[PDB]
Structures are given as C-alpha cells and as structure tokens.
From Swiss-Prot, chains A, B:
GO terms for cellular component: extracellular region. Synthesized in mammary gland and secreted in milk. Primary component of whey, it binds retinol and is probably involved in the transport of that molecule. Belongs to the calycin superfamily. Lipocalin family. Disulfide bonds join 65-156, 105-115, 105-117. The gene is LGB. GO terms for molecular function: identical protein binding; long-chain fatty acid binding; retinol binding. Gene3D superfamilies: 2.40.128.20. It comes from Bos taurus (Bovine). The keyword Protein biosynthesis does not apply. This is Beta-lactoglobulin. It is found in: Secreted. Alternate disulfide bonds occur in equal amounts in all variants examined. Under physiological conditions beta-lactoglobulin exists as an equilibrium mixture of monomeric and dimeric forms. Interaction with LMBR1L which mediates the endocytosis of LGB has been observed in PubMed:17991420, but not in PubMed:23964685.
C-alpha cells in the first residue's frame, strides 16, 4: 500500500530533534479532532544501538497534552519498522536528507494510513512539503493538515 | 486575498444540484470538527432572476444535520457575492464548466478563508480536484479534506 521507501537508509543518522510540519491520513477521523488517533506530534527519533527506532511524541489525551514513548522494532527491510500491538503496525521511512526533512508513514493492516512531513526546525520548508505532496499522490489520503512556526513551538501544536 | 475569479461568469447557468467533493481552509479549526464553522455541505445553488445567489446547504448543529438557506447578494463583479452579516463575507466563483465542476471560496475580511470543489454527481472527478489544487497553491490553506462517493450520498457526509 506504501510502495515508497528510502533506498539506503542509515537509521542512526535520523536521531534527535524533529517537528511534525504536515500530516495526512486515509480517513478524516484519523486526524480531524485534536484527540484523533493519528494526530501524534513527533518530539524526537532515537535509534537504539541494535537498529530499533524509538519515537518520542505528544498526543492530546482527554484534557492534557501527554508525553508518549513508543518503540518500533527493526526488520529485514532497513526502512520498515514494526510495533506489534493489536495489529501489525508498520513505520516506513519514505525519504530523508537527514538534516532538513524526513517523510514517513504509519500503516495498520486492517487500510488505516497516516504520513507525516518532519523537519528539523520550526520553519515552513516549501521544498520538503513539495516532496511530501509528491509521495501522497500515490496514496488514498482524504485529510491533510499543516502547522505554522508559532504552533510548532507549542505543546501539541495548540 | 483571492485573486482568482472566473472571467465571463453566467450565474444562471450554475443553478441546481451540487456536491461538496473537497474542502480547504486557512485554519484547521475552520474544518476539523464536524461542527467546525466552514464545514458546510452544498445541496443546491439557486440564482434569483435579479442575479442574486441562493445557497442551500447542510451543517451539523449540536446533534442533527440541519438544512440552511443563505442568500449571497450580487455585486458589480459578476463572480463575487456578499452576505452582509457580522462581517463582510464574500462568495467568489473561481472557475466552472457549469456541467461537471465549480470551484468557489468564501472569505471573511477580519483572513478566514474556505474554498470548495463542487461537482454535479457523487463521483471522484480527478480533473476537478487537480484544478482545485492548482487554485489553492496560491492560498494560505492549512487543512484540506475530500469525500468518497458513499459519503457524498449521506446527509452531512457521515
Ligand atoms: C498511540 N499512538 C502513539 C500510536 C498510534 C498512532 N500511530 C502511530 C504514531 C506514531 C508512531 C507509530 C504509530 S503506529 C500507527 C499506525 C497507523 C496509524 Cl493510522 C497511526 C499510528
Ligand atoms: C453559517 N454558514 C451557513 C455560513 C458560514 C460559513 N461560510 C459560508 C458557507 C456557505 C456560504 C457562505 C458562507 S460565508 C463564509 C465566509 C467565510 C468562511 Cl471561513 C465561511 C463561510
């Protein structure tokens, strides 16, 4: 369903600070409410020395903006990670230059699909957004969002 | 702010049945909740004989999906209509071929801006969506939505 992975991914090199500039999802209800399931705001990507990928992120739960840490285990494919939860959830890195931008998707085999355009600073990278839009033409997305520099510096983008 | 109007608009010819295929807005909160302010689902456009434009639409209010009728008065500019309410609200027709598609925007001078891609049938017109996307490149939109043929036939797109 996501036929776009980064060739030659060096995962150690995605470590550190990231900003969820834009999001997009297969279904409107995955992103429309602040508490919508795919509305996760990346804080930080932390590769483990064994090539697993730890994602630190914020999520609006009930009232507060909550901190969450989730581990995405490595696979044979360098650009694909698994969170064995209620379903097979895969994290796929589509593309990155390591230092400005990183596109990735999360897909639950059930059909549910959300992708993000991550950037290193709180700025609108119009180039990174072009690349994001190009990889989404291929996908059955029905909601897209984008954040301004002010919202990027707030918790949960409020 | 919207520098894209249809040249040579014949307003009588937009009359009758329409479907809100896609929406997009300047701010996420204009479209994110089902009760979000710019989340209006067009039923029908009815030109009056004096060249005023009556919009019949559905809006999710409190619980139910409500019917609403609003009149947009004519101006010197054939493609621009006004709803004199709490602010100057203008309805602008950007483009149409009358028989498949119509792009229009609603703007409140305050900054608040929502645009829609209307189509005549419940079908995904990939061409009409391309034209919609081309007119939005020019605008400071931060949320976009799109509906499937099943949702187009439900009240309020549920
Ligand atoms: C509770 N939330 C931290 C995890 C669920 C949200 N989500 C997600 C987000 C960040 C990292 C991995 C995932 S797995 C996934 C697969 C499909 C969809 Cl649609 C969303 C997600
Ligand atoms: C109560 N709702 C029927 C009218 C308000 C929603 N809305 C709108 C929708 C359909 C026809 C005209 C308008 S004026 C307008 C201007 C700016 C924005 Cl952002 C939204 C709107």
């Amino acid at each position: 369903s996501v036929t776009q992975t980064m060739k030659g991914l060096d995962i150690q090199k995605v470590a550190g600070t990231w900003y969820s500039l834009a999001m997009a999802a297969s279904d409107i209800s995955l992103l429309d409410a602040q508490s919508a399931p795919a509305r996760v705001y990346v804080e930080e990507l932390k590769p483990t020395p064994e090539g697993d990928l730890e994602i630190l992120l914020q999520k609006w739960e009930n009232g507060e903006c909550a901190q969450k840490k989730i581990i995405a285990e490595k696979t044979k494919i360098p650009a694909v990670f698994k969170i064995d939860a209620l379903n097979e959830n895969k994290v796929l890195v589509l593309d990155t230059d390591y230092k400005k931008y990183l596109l990735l998707c999360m897909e639950n085999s059930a059909q549910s699909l959300a992708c993000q355009c991550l950037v290193r600073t709180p700025e609108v990278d119009d180039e990174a957004l072009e690349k994001f839009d190009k990889a989404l033409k291929a996908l059955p997305m029905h909601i897209r969002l984008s954040f301004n520099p002010t919202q990027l510096e707030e918790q949960c983008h409020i």
